[PDB]
């Protein structure tokens, strides 16, 4: 009874442990796959790229928001975004559909979120560093940017806007 119950319990637990490991392994295969698609573009570039938050609004590519959007490939735009208290420049961000948008985002004060609603763009923006991420917008229109890292009392109302043109 107890000797038996124990034997059967331990046999089957080993069944479970093998199947679960299996399932974990498959998830790993499925994550890997995503790494090989274009959907991995939203993973940040893990290169260090250091800036000076104290001068970033005075010099460099964040200094003049109406020139944040540069064509860097025959189908590619780099966009220099400032995330700051409490908003995003430029507002709006204007990019064309179909084109690969490299976002290079930074902050002059504290940390912010950059979460593009409707998309997989979700990146922490740290002052002193440039966060780089890649997305292609397939559908034209208006995406909301949401800040999703607490950044002080203005956190709940800090929003931005990406317009994707036809």
């Amino acid at each position: 009874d107890e000797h038996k119950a124990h034997k059967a319990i331990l046999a089957y637990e080993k069944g479970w442990l093998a199947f679960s490991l299996a399932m974990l392994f498959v998830f790993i295969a499925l994550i890997a796959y995503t790494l090989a698609t274009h959907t991995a573009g939203v993973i940040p570039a893990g290169k260090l790229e250091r800036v000076d938050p104290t001068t970033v609004r005075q010099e460099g590519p964040w200094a003049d928001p109406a020139q944040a959007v540069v064509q860097t490939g025959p189908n590619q735009y780099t966009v220099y975004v400032l995330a700051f208290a409490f908003g995003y420049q430029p507002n709006p961000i204007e990019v064309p559909q179909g084109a690969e948008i490299v976002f290079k985002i930074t902050s002059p004060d504290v940390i912010h979120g950059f979460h593009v609603e409707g998309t997989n763009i979700n990146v922490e923006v740290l002052p002193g560093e440039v966060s780089t991420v890649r997305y292609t917008f397939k559908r034209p229109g208006e995406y909301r940017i949401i800040c999703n890292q607490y950044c002080g009392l203005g956190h709940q109302n800090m929003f931005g806007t990406i317009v994707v043109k036809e």
Binding site: Y12, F19, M23, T34, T39, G118, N120
Partner: protein, 31 residues
């Protein structure tokens, strides 16, 4: 066999699969 113990891990597997496959779908819908 431990019939009940297995029911538990059935539910747990199903919960996990639903969660993970769910969010996988979402990830790709947004990709």
């Amino acid at each position: 066999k431990p019939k009940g113990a297995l029911a538990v891990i059935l539910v747990l597997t199903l919960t996990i699969l639903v969660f993970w496959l769910g969010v996988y779908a979402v990830f790709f819908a947004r990709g």
